[PDB]
Amino acid sequence: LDNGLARTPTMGWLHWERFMCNLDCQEEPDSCISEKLFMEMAELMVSEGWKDAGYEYLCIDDCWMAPQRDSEGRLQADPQRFPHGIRQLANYVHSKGLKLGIYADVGNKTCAGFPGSFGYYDIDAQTFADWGVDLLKFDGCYCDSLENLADGYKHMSLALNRTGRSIVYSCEWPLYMWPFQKPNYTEIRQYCNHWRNFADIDDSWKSIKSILDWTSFNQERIVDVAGPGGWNDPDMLVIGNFGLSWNQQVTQMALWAIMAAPLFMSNDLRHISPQAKALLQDKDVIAINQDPLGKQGYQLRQGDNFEVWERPLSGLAWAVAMINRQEIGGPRSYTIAVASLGKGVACNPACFITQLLPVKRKLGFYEWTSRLRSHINPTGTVLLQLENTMQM
Amino acid sequence: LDNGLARTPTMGWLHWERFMCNLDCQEEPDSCISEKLFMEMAELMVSEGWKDAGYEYLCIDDCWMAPQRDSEGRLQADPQRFPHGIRQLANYVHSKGLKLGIYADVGNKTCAGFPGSFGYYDIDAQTFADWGVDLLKFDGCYCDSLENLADGYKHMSLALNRTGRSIVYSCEWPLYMWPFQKPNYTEIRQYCNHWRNFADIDDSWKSIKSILDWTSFNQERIVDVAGPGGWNDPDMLVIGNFGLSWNQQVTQMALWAIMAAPLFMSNDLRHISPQAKALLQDKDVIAINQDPLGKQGYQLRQGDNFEVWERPLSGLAWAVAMINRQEIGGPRSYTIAVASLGKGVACNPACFITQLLPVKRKLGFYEWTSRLRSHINPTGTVLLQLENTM
Ligand SMILES: *[C@@H]1O[C@H](CO)[C@@H](O[C@@H]2O[C@H](CO)[C@@H](O[C@@H]3O[C@H](CO)[C@@H](O)[C@H](O[C@H]4O[C@H](CO)[C@@H](O)[C@H](O)[C@@H]4O)[C@@H]3O)[C@H](O)[C@H]2NC(C)=O)[C@H](O)[C@H]1NC(C)=O
Ligand SMILES: *[C@@H]1O[C@H](CO)[C@@H](O[C@@H]2O[C@H](CO)[C@@H](O[C@@H]3O[C@H](CO)[C@@H](O)[C@H](O[C@H]4O[C@H](CO)[C@@H](O)[C@H](O)[C@@H]4O)[C@@H]3O)[C@H](O)[C@H]2NC(C)=O)[C@H](O)[C@H]1NC(C)=O
Ligand SMILES: *[C@@H]1O[C@H](CO)[C@@H](O[C@@H]2O[C@H](CO)[C@@H](O[C@@H]3O[C@H](CO)[C@@H](O)[C@H](O)[C@@H]3O)[C@H](O)[C@H]2NC(C)=O)[C@H](O)[C@H]1NC(C)=O
Numbered sequence: 001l002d003n004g005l006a007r008t009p010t011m012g013w014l015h016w017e018r019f020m021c022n023l024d025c026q027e028e029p030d031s032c033i034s035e036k037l038f039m040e041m042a043e044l045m046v047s048e049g050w051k052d053a054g055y056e057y058l059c060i061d062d063c064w065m066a067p068q069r070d071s072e073g074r075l076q077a078d079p080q081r082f083p084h085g086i087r088q089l090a091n092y093v094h095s096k097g098l099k100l101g102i103y104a105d106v107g108n109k110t111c112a113g114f115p116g117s118f119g120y121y122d123i124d125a126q127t128f129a130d131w132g133v134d135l136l137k138f139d140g141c142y143c144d145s146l147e148n149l150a151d152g153y154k155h156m157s158l159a160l161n162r163t164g165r166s167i168v169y170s171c172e173w174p175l176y177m178w179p180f181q182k183p184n185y186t187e188i189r190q191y192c193n194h195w196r197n198f199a200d201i202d203d204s205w206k207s208i209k210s211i212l213d214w215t216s217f218n219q220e221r222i223v224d225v226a227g228p229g230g231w232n233d234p235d236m237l238v239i240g241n242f243g244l245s246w247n248q249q250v251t252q253m254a255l256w257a258i259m260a261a262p263l264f265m266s267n268d269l270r271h272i273s274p275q276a277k278a279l280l281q282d283k284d285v286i287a288i289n290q291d292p293l294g295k296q297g298y299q300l301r302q303g304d305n306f307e308v309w310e311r312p313l314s315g316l317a318w319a320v321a322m323i324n325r326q327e328i329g330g331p332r333s334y335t336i337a338v339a340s341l342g343k344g345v346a347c348n349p350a351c352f353i354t355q356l357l358p359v360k361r362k363l364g365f366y367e368w369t370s371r372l373r374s375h376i377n378p379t380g381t382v383l384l385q386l387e388n389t390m391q392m
Numbered sequence: 393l394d395n396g397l398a399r400t401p402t403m404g405w406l407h408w409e410r411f412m413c414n415l416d417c418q419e420e421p422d423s424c425i426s427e428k429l430f431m432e433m434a435e436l437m438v439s440e441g442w443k444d445a446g447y448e449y450l451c452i453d454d455c456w457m458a459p460q461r462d463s464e465g466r467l468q469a470d471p472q473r474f475p476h477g478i479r480q481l482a483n484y485v486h487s488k489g490l491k492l493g494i495y496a497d498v499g500n501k502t503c504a505g506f507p508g509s510f511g512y513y514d515i516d517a518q519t520f521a522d523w524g525v526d527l528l529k530f531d532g533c534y535c536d537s538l539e540n541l542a543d544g545y546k547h548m549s550l551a552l553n554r555t556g557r558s559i560v561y562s563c564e565w566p567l568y569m570w571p572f573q574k575p576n577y578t579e580i581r582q583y584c585n586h587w588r589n590f591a592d593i594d595d596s597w598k599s600i601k602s603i604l605d606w607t608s609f610n611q612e613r614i615v616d617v618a619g620p621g622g623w624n625d626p627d628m629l630v631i632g633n634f635g636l637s638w639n640q641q642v643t644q645m646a647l648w649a650i651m652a653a654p655l656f657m658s659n660d661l662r663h664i665s666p667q668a669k670a671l672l673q674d675k676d677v678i679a680i681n682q683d684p685l686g687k688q689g690y691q692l693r694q695g696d697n698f699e700v701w702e703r704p705l706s707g708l709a710w711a712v713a714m715i716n717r718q719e720i721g722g723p724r725s726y727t728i729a730v731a732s733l734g735k736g737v738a739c740n741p742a743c744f745i746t747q748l749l750p751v752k753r754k755l756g757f758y759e760w761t762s763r764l765r766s767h768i769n770p771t772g773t774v775l776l777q778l779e780n781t782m
C-alpha cells in the first residue's frame with residue numbers, strides 16, 4: 001500500500017493474545033479490555049523504554065465496542081469499559097508520543113460477535129479518522145464469499161484513503177482466502193500495509209513451530225512480495241508471557257527479524273521479566289527487523305533437525321539464524337562454509353561475524369573460504385550478523 | 393519390592409535425557425558419556441547442595457558398555473571412556489556419600505545396541521553387585537516375547553536379591569508390555585522398586601502434558617499399587633534444560649511431587665540457572681514428594697482447561713495442585729469448595745492453606761464452608777499444602 005506508511009515493519013503492542021475478549025471488569029479488572037488498561041500500558045510504553053526501542057503503536061483488538069451502533073448508525077466505545085470514548089484515549093496516547101490502533105471486521109460481526117463493518121465501510125473509516133486512530137487491524141470473520149471479502153478489504157482501504165488521514169491498514173485478507181482459493185499477493189499489496197497469512201498465534205512453542213513451518217513451506221509464494229509499504233504478518237510477539245522457554249523466546253525474536261515481520265508485542269508490560277524485556281528491546285536485533293532495504297529473509301537449508309535462515313540487509317550485510325529443532329539432548333554443533341551464506345556475497349572476500357543471540361559476541365574476520373562453527377540449544381536459535389569487508 | 397529400599401521415591405541424577413548416547417569424546421570431551429562426566433556431576437551434587445536436598449543416586453544410563461562381553465562372558469565398561477572401570481567409579485561416588493546407578497536391558501541388546509543381558513541375568517547381577525552398584529535401570533528393547541519380558545524382569549529381580557547387596561531395581565516391564573496386554577501391577581511391584589509406564593520424556597511441554605494425560609487416564613489401575621518399596625515412574629525431571637518455560641518447569645516439579653514419582657534430574661549441574669536450582673532444591677515440595685505415608689496422588693477434577701490433583705499426606709495434611717491447560721491469554725481464575733478437597737476431611741472443620749508454588753505464601757485459615765480462589769498461569773500449576781486444624 002503506497003500511503004507513505006510502514007516503510008519498515010510496524011512496531012507496537014496489541015492486547016489480543018494476552019488479554020483476549022475479557023469483558024468481566026467486576027471479577028477480572030486487571031485483565032478486562034478497558035480504557036484504563038490502555039492508559040496504563042501507554043504510560044509504561046513511555047517510562048519502561050518501549051517507545052525509545054521503536055514500539056510506537058498502542059493497538060486495541062476485538063471487544064472495544066458497544067453491542068450496537070448509535071442512533072446515527074456509527075460504532076461506539078463500550079460505555080462501561082470505555083466511558084471517556086476513543087477520541088479522549090487517542091488524545092492521551094498522542095500526548096505520550098505514541099499512535100493508537102483500533103480493530104474492526106470486514107464481515108457482518110467481529111470474530112468476538114460485536115458489530116461488523118459491512119454496509120458501513122465509509123462511515124466506520126470516517127469515525128476512526130474523527131477519533132484520531134493511526135492504525136486499523138481488519139479481521140475477516142462472518143463474511144459470505146471471496147467476492148465480499150475481497151470487495152470489503154478493497155473498499156475499507158479506499159475509504160480510509162478518502163478520510164485523507166495517515167492510517168496504517170492491517171488486513172487478514174490472505175488468511176480468510178485460503179479456505180476458498182490461493183491468495184493473489186500483488187493485489188493484496190496494492191491495498192494493505194501488512195497482511196496476516198496464517199492461524200492466530202498462542203503462547204506455545206507448537207504455535208511458533210507451526211508459523212515457521214507454514215512460512216518456509218510457502219516462502220516462494222510470499223517472500224518477494226514483501227517490502228517497504230507492504231509486509232507479511234506472522235502474528236504477534238508472545239515473549240514475556242508463560243508458554244515459551246528462554247530459547248523458544250530467542251527463536252521468535254530472531255526469526256521475526258529474519259522475516260521482516262511487524263513486531264506487535266502481546267504481553268503485560270506491568271509484569272515482564274528483565275530477560276524478556278532486554279530481548280524485546282535488543283537494539284541490534286530490532287535493527288535487523290527494521291533494515292531500510294526491507295527484503296524478507298527465508299529458509300536456506302533444513303535437515304538433521306536443523307534449519308538455516310538468512311536475510312539480506314543494506315550495505316552487503318546478512319543476518320543468519322541457525323535453529324535446532326531437536327527437542328531432546330544438549331547443544332548441537334553445526335558447521336557451514338561461510339561461502340554458502342549470503343549467496344556467496346556476504347564473506348567475499350571476507351566478512352566480520354558478530355553473534356547477536358542468544359548473547360552478543362564478536363566472532364571476528366572469516367575469509368570467503370572459512371567454516372563457521374556454532375553450538376545451538378534445543379528449540380533455540382543462534383542469530384549472526386555478517387558484515388562484508390576487505391580488511392582481511 | 394520388599395528389599396527395604398525406595399521406602400520413599402528414589403532421588404538423584406541420570407545422564408540420558410540431557411547427554412543421551414554421545415560417544416564422541418574427541419570433538420566433545422565435555423558432553424560425551426565418560427567417567428569424567430559422572431565425576432563432575434558427583435562433585436557438584438556434594439558442593440552445590442543436591443545431596444543435602446536428598447539427590448543421592450548418581451546413575452549411568454545406556455552407552456557405558458564396551459561393544460562386546462569379556463573372555464569370561466561379563467559386561468565391560470568401554471575401556472577409553474571408563475578407563476578405571478565401574479567398581480572404581482562406584483568407589484569414588486561412595487567416598488562422596490552418594491550411590492551409583494547403572495543400566496542394562498532385559499533382551500538381546502540395549503536400546504542403543506550394546507550387549508543385552510538375556511542369557512546372562514545371573515552373571516550380570518553378580519558383576520553389578522561385585523562393582524558396588526547401588527541401583528539398576530533395566531530397559532526392555534530387543535525382547536521377542538511377553539514370556540521372555542516377564543521371565544527376564546522376574547529373573548533379574550531374583551538374581552539381584554541373591555547377590556546379597558541392596559540394589560534399587562528400576563524396571564520398564566509395564567511400558568514394554570502395554571502395547572500387547574494390560575500389565576498386572578500387583579505382580580510388577582512384587583519384583584520392582586519402580587516401573588516405567590510411558591514413552592521416554594523429551595525437553596518439551598508436549599512430553600510433560602502427554603505423561604500427565606496418560607497417568608490421569610490410567611489412574612484407576614496404577615495409583616493404589618504405589619507405596620513404600622514400589623512407585624510409578626513417569627520418567628526424568630528435565631527442569632534446568634532448554635524446552636520448558638518457567639511455568640512448565642513448576643508444573644513438572646509440582647505434579648512429580650503429587651504423583652510420588654522418583655525424582656531423577658537429567659540436566660547439566662555445571663550450567664543450571666539459579667531459578668531451576670531453587671525449584672529442584674525446594675525443601676517443602678521435596679517433603680511432599682518424600683512423604684513417608686507414600687500414598688500416590690491422583691486427578692480429582694478436569695474441566696474448562698483446568699485440572700485439580702491431590703495427594704493425601706502424613707498427619708492429616710493434603711497437597712493440592714491446580715493446572716491451567718489453556719495455552720493462550722493470562723492468569724485464569726479457578727475456585728473450588730475446600731469441602732471438595734481431600735475427600736471432605738482436609739478442611740473439616742478447617743485447614744490452614746500454604747501456597748508452595750509458584751511462590752511460598754501463607755493464605756490463612758479456610759473453614760469447611762470456604763472456597764479457595766486462585767489465578768493460574770497458562771501451562772503453570774499452583775501447589776498448596778492443607779493442614780487440618782484438628
Ligand atoms: C491515498 O492514495 C494515494 C494514491 O496511492 C496516495 O498517494 C501516494 O502517496 C505516496 C506517499 O506520500 C507518494 O509518494 C511520494 O512521492 C513524493 C514525490 O514524488 C516523494 O516525496 C515521497 O518520497 C518519500 O519516500 C522516499 C523513499 O521512497 C524518500 O526518499 C523521501 O524522503 C520521502 O520520505 C514519496 O515517494 C505518491 O506520490 C502518491 N501517489 C499518488 C498517485 O498520488 C496517498 O498518500 C493516499 N493518502 C492517504 C492519506 O491514504
Ligand atoms: C531379598 O528378598 C527378601 C524377601 O523379600 C528381602 O527380605 C525382606 O527384607 C526387608 C528389609 O530388610 C524386611 O523388612 C524389614 O525387616 C528389617 C529387619 O528386622 C526391619 O528393620 C525393617 O524395618 C524398617 O522399617 C521400619 C518402619 O516400620 C523402621 O522402624 C525400622 O527402623 C527399619 O528401618 C523391615 O521390617 C522384610 O521383612 C524381608 N522379608 C522377608 C520375607 O524376609 C531381602 O531384603 C532381600 N535382600 C536383598 C539383598 O535384596
Ligand atoms: C535372543 O536371540 C536368540 C537367537 O536369535 C533368540 O532365540 C530364539 O528365539 C525364538 C523364539 O522367538 C526361537 O524360535 C522358535 O522355534 C520354535 C521351534 O523350536 C518355533 O515353534 C517358534 O515359533 C520359534 O520360531 C529360537 O529357537 C530361539 N533360538 C535359540 C538359539 O534359542 C532369543 O529368543 C532372543 N531373546 C529375546 C529375549 O528376544
Ligand SMILES: *[C@@H]1O[C@H](CO)[C@@H](O[C@@H]2O[C@H](CO)[C@@H](O)[C@H](O)[C@H]2NC(C)=O)[C@H](O)[C@H]1NC(C)=O
Nearest residue numbers: 150154182183184185186187188189190191225
Ligand atoms: C493479481 O492481481 C493483480 C492486481 O489486481 C493483477 O495485476 C494486474 O491485472 C490487471 C488486470 O486484471 C492489469 O490491468 C495489470 O496489467 C496487472 N498488473 C499490475 C496492475 O501490476 C494480476 O493479474 C493478478 N495475478 C494473477 C497471476 O492473476
Ligand SMILES: *[C@@H]1O[C@H](CO)[C@@H](O)[C@H](O)[C@H]1NC(C)=O
Nearest residue numbers: 106107108118142143144148
Ligand atoms: C450480511 O447480512 C445480510 C443480511 O442477511 C446479507 O445480505 C449479507 O450478504 C451479509 N454480508 C456479509 C458481508 O457477510
Ligand SMILES: *[C@@H]1O[C@H](CO)[C@@H](O)[C@H](O)[C@H]1NC(C)=O
Nearest residue numbers: 575576577578579580581582
Ligand atoms: C496379579 O498378580 C498377583 C501376584 O502375582 C496374583 O496373585 C494375581 O492373582 C494376579 N491377578 C490377575 C488378575 O491376573
Ligand SMILES: *[C@]12N[C@H]1[C@H](CO)[C@H](O)[C@H](O)[C@H]2O
Nearest residue numbers: 016061062111112139172200
Ligand atoms: C481475528 N480471531 C480474531 C481475533 C479477534 O477476535 C484476533 O484479532 C485475531 O488476531 C484475528 O485473526
Ligand SMILES: *[C@]12N[C@H]1[C@H](CO)[C@H](O)[C@H](O)[C@H]2O
Nearest residue numbers: 408453454502503504531592
Ligand atoms: C530405554 N529408550 C531407552 C534409553 C536407553 O537406550 C533410555 O534409558 C530410556 O529412558 C529407556 O526407556
